[PDB]
Design a protein around this ligand. Structure first.
Ligand code: GGS
Ligand code: GGS
Ligand code: ISY
Ligand code: ISY
Ligand code: MG
Ligand code: MG
Lengths: 321, 200, 321, 200
């Protein structure tokens, strides 16, 4: 699926500027599309899958090698059994057709990750999912994250629960909990935060998708229904990103510099309190504030790196299987 | 005054739905924000019947100039709309001035507080679900924002309460700098017309 | 008194490198010189004055425009009346011949300062001294500081006493006392610390001279007796300075950077304590630590600058007269 | 051991005068100092009869490595010279490790302490003379250094106890790095030969 002349030309032009490394999609509007085409709702969703495959080829042709998609919300479990089963069966088809199509997965280096509270899915679907993930690890040429039975609050709650597990197990002190640590406990911990969040149809809301990860992302709300997505919709979204990029990255960097500044102030106030209780002075040629500060940080890093190594060990315990 | 107050109340009641909590997000950093325009937005929200207003900028300018902002709100809550301490208390209850630390840093703070309870053998990791964490977020007893008005050229929420905006409608206006009541109310009827299906 | 060919040539050469702006002299060995020449001790000291005038002309010819000399120690009051009176009378001659020679003082812009516990000198000598100082203020082409009835411990003790006076009068808080403040209360407060300290005769000690001011100065102990000082002795001392200059100024700068670092740590620990007692956090977006820190420094500077203005007002109260 | 101890004592007694307090000033910063050479200097001072030794460098290296220095002194105070806690206590009483903050910063500290007494109406400015200030210097009960051995290429005291060196004899050696007893003792007889007239 190569690009046409105009698509290729326009791609070359915008590639002279900053390009997103990671794009996230809320693929919304499948049912309204089915009503507009006078088709059953199941074919609205099947058309939705075909558009996902097409759009992924567009990203690849643009050098965007990591994509995250909202495929099923925990909230979507509230739909009718007829519709829920239809979606589960679609997932059963594609994840099984992802098998057989292996080696074509290895040849192109496609890593597949499926994120969410997967214990809510049918037991058989969890096995297919685990197979696809187990096979496509170690692949590193492109990355597709499928958010399946996912909400962002459920992901954030789980990250905190894992940090509380580290404390309960003794690998973590409550003082070690930080924004960065929570980042490394999310389901998305192996990918950078998305440069763009795209939601289709007319909705201007996030519907519990990547709330932590997209706090500084460029947000693009496009009226088109998802099964009607075109290359030029995608192109428009990237155009938005490029126009926002300088102010957005300065704000992203100011946020980071402000967080590190405040952390340094908090740590040095900690060193001050421990020094004040002790007869020891606030400052001195012995520079004991400076060595207490380095030990405070180093012992924190060793505890965190030990907790993360243990968290990844129990994450990679499937086996589930 | 009784006429202007009655008119703004009928305006709010005429809409299909009103936000209980509105967020004002200012992204423009090419100039110091206009306190008089922000205060007019806040006073309109209160006069049309919106219970809570959060004012936010990612640089913390409003947070470092809290008194000037409140004083401007109070001044314009007179003149428009016609017990000073009662008026002061009622604005402190309705108006929160936020900065980035009220989002991710506050979630981290709640995680620290919860994890120290686990350390004291008073809670278990499994005791923390979605609703429990929301209970100790530092924004307890207050509803989540239904509507955010984002002003300026940045197409990002820039750190505004990421946990709380899961279902928030985000309406973008190009600038707050000479905002008119008609422009503000246009955004209100946009929110009134939006359809939230909650996953169904 | 111009330089000879060899002196001028050598001067030009070393002037290509760093030159001292301020040199301090302990003019020692006058009495041993008198014993070696078989002259009365009074002419040993008079020869000592002639060498001071010659050496000052050398400094001027070298672009060294500020010189400090040890002319009489408080300890020297312990000598015989015959010798003490001889020295006082020499001072009576030169300080009076400094008058009459005015206008020649104005034409060359020679500022004369006399530093020490001057209330120990004869009352008439204090009047001559005050005249010379009053006349040569506002002159700024070169500066000669005559340490008369001086010791360094007496100068340091007086500086602290002046700071204690500022506290007693309400212009100063005890927390405002600093190394820099003490610097500005010394007798030498109008001159930079000396680049070189030179002591003649064989003695390798400082004899209570400029102990605070020469802590980072290049120290030169030369065996020659002071009445025998030559241009080349002075040249040798400057040669020592130039060879020490890079390591000495790095140490001088590291000291300064370390003092400012420790002061910043002390001040921010102060801000921390006041913040901790208060409910207020160690850090925050409101950045109140940063504004409390600027007010702490600014209110300190205004108090110090008000104390210094009052100290100079009562210093310039002579009138003494 | 009884022979080496007796020999060093007779050496000290043979001199016309011995310093009661010696300062060791290290200016060389082109390499980390040699702890074993500094300790040998300290142990020689003690064995010849010098009561106090101050070790100083303007970078504070000895102050930040106090334990390594003392341990090296203790080790060499055995082997040479032949109750460990008594030996530890006697070296802590004789050996001070100084940095620049023990000079000017300590004088400033005494000034702060004195000026707060004035603030409390318990002292007057005129109560502070030369000897009073020396009494509250933070180096009280200890004599001023009579002799400073300055090692290395810098012709400066580099901040070493400016108040206390008013009459100190300053002898310069080019390096401490492989210092010999004969070289150290040569400096001692130089101090022994010096004549201090005290202004008379
Ligand atoms: C897990 C699964 C189902 C499939 C796995 C394969 C995969 C990654 C995607 C297949 C399914 C695809 C592409 C999209 C369906 C996701 C979904 C519920 C979108 C909401 S459109 P709405 O229903 O809301 O329509 P309106 O808003 O118009 O009412
Ligand atoms: C105030 C006054 C006297 C003169 C004012 C004019 C002036 C600036 C200087 C004139 C006097 C001069 C040049 C030098 C005398 C200063 C002095 C006591 C030097 C010690 S030599 P020691 O006596 O110690 O001889 P040894 O060490 O060999 O025993
Ligand atoms: C799987 C998904 C793309 C779910 C997010 S889109 P959804 O239509 O469910 O969002 P709501 O209008 O809030 O119901
Ligand atoms: C006026 C002066 C130059 C005094 C300093 S030199 P002086 O000979 O007095 O120093 P001492 O040998 O300690 O007596
Ligand atoms: Mg939808
Ligand atoms: Mg002399």
């Amino acid at each position: 699926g190569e690009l046409s002349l105009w698509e290729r030309f326009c791609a070359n032009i915008i590639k002279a500027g900053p390009m997103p490394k990671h794009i996230a999609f809320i693929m919304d509007g499948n049912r309204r599309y089915a009503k507009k085409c006078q088709v059953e709702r199941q074919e609205g969703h099947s058309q939705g899958f075909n558009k996902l495959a097409e759009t992924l080829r567009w990203c690849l042709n643009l050098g965007i090698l990591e994509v995250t998609v909202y495929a099923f919300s925990i909230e979507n479990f509230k739909r009718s059994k007829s519709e829920v089963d239809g979606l589960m069966d679609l997932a059963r088809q594609k994840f099984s057709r992802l098998m057989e199509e292996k080696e074509k997965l290895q040849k192109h280096g496609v890593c597949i990750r499926v994120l969410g509270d997967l214990h809510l899915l049918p037991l058989d679907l969890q096995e297919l999912i685990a197979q696809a993930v187990q096979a496509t690890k170690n692949y590193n040429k492109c990355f597709l994250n499928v958010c399946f039975a996912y909400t962002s609050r459920h992901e954030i709650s789980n990250a905190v629960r894992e940090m509380a597990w580290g404390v309960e197990q003794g690998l973590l002190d409550p003082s070690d909990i930080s924004e960065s640590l929570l980042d490394k406990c999310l389901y998305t911990n192996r990918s950078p935060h998305p440069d763009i969040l795209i939601r289709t149809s007319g909705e201007v809301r996030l519907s519990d998708f990547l709330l932590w990860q997209t706090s500084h992302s460029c947000l693009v709300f496009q009226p088109v229904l998802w099964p009607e997505y075109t290359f030029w919709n995608l192109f428009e979204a990237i155009l938005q990103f490029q126009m926002n990029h300088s102010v957005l990255q300065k704000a992203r960097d100011m946020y980071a510099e402000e967080r590190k500044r405040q952390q340094l102030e908090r740590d040095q106030a900690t060193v001050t309190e421990q020094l004040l209780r002790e007869g020891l002075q606030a400052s001195g040629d012995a520079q004991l504030r400076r060595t207490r500060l380095h030990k405070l940080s180093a012992r924190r890093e060793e505890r965190v790196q030990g907790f993360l190594q243990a968290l990844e060990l129990k994450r990679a315990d499937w086996l589930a299987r | 005054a009784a006429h202007h107050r009655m008119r703004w109340r009928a305006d709010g009641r005429s809409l299909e739905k009103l936000p209980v909590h509105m967020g004002l997000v200012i992204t423009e950093v090419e100039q110091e924000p206009s306190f008089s325009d922000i205060a007019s937005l806040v006073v309109w929200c209160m006069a049309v019947g919106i219970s809570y207003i959060s004012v936010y900028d990612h640089q913390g300018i409003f947070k470092r100039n809290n008194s000037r902002l409140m004083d401007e709100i109070l001044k314009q809550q007179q003149e428009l709309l016609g017990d000073k301490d009662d008026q002061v208390l009622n604005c402190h209850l309705a108006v929160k001035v936020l900065s980035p630390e009220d989002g991710k840093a506050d979630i981290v703070r709640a995680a620290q507080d919860f994890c120290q309870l686990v350390a004291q053998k008073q809670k278990r990791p499994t005791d923390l679900d979605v609703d429990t964490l929301a209970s100790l977020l530092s924004s307890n007893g207050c509803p989540d924002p239904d509507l955010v008005l984002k002003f300026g050229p940045v197409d990002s929420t820039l750190g505004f309460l990421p946990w709380h905006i899961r279902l928030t409608e985000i309406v973008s206006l190009p600038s707050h700098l000479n905002i008119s009541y008609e422009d503000f109310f246009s955004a209100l009827r946009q929110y009134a017309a939006c359809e939230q299906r909650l996953g169904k």
